């Protein structure tokens, strides 16, 4: 996160850390959607062009974390993965279209003050909230500049109009993505950066006071560059595949 702030304790109890064993290291962000399911970006696990292709044996999920580096002895819970599911149509060849994956934990996590699931949007919620001008929130332990924080960082960014998104890159944008950030004429700045991938873009419904995950940190060219925007996986658009896997497994 660039131009973010330290998160408050218990601010994003769904925030999950993807962590590799050997070498021990921070892979990506992720989100807790239930006691047994985690949502992340597919590119966190598979990206052939960088020879990236992780299996369940390769990683650990760290939940209820605040500190990037510390083993939060009485607070975090660490889980092993049972199985990984990448969208059958994730396009790592071209534009990271459908950048989403599900991870099934070996055992369910008990909730706590620091661990709690985020809601997945419904058609009406997605409809009311996914509006240009509307602000969402991103969190991660990623790079501070296009440099590593000691604690989870947070930033609030407005959804940008689809035309603007399209005109800011040479990359082929799809309906499965949305962009967010401030424009050069608004004087505020901030963005996600490497290390933040797989993290949630959340919005708080004004109807029911609940937090919903609308996006997954996906891609961007550099970080917090003027006239550029961060791209996120459009969660609602991929909801049927999510549901499909959950019911099926």
């Amino acid at each position: 996160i660039v131009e973010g702030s330290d998160a408050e304790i218990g601010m994003s109890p769904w925030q999950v850390m993807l962590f590799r064993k050997s070498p021990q290291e921070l892979l990506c962000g992720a989100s807790l959607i239930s006691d047994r399911w985690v949502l992340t970006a597919a590119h966190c696990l598979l990206y052939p062009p960088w020879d990236k292709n992780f299996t369940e044996n390769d990683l650990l999920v760290r939940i209820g974390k605040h500190s990037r580096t510390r083993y939060e002895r009485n607070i975090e819970k660490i889980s092993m993965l049972e199985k990984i599911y990448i969208h059958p149509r994730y396009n790592w060849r071209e534009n990271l279209d459908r950048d989403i994956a599900l991870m099934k934990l070996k055992k369910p996590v008990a909730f706590s003050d620091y661990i709690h699931p985020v809601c997945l949007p419904d058609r009406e919620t997605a409809a009311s909230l996914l509006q240009a001008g509307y602000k969402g929130r991103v969190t991660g332990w990623g790079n501070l500049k296009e440099g590593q924080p000691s604690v989870l960082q947070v930033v609030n960014l407005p959804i940008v109009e689809r035309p603007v998104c399209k005109d800011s890159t040479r990359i082929r944008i799809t309906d499965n993505m949305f962009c967010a950030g401030y424009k050069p004429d608004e004087g505020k700045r901030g963005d996600a950066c490497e290390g933040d991938s797989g993290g949630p873009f959340v919005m708080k419904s004004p109807f029911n006071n609940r937090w919903y995950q609308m996006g997954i940190v996906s891609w961007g060219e550099g970080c917090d560059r003027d006239g550029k925007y961060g791209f996120y996986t459009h969660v609602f658009r991929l909801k049927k595949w999510i549901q499909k896997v959950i019911d099926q497994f």
């Binding site: 601010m11 709690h116 985020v118 929130r137 609030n156 407005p158 609940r210």
Partner: peptide, 26 residues
């Protein structure tokens, strides 16, 4: 279920330091 309601916030009726920014944009 009980999704999206944080134990240390919504459940206790406390607001985080910048959530108002979000709500104000809606």
């Amino acid at each position: 279920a009980d999704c999206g309601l944080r134990p240390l916030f919504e459940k206790k009726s406390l607001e985080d330091k910048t959530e108002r920014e979000l709500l104000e944009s809606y």
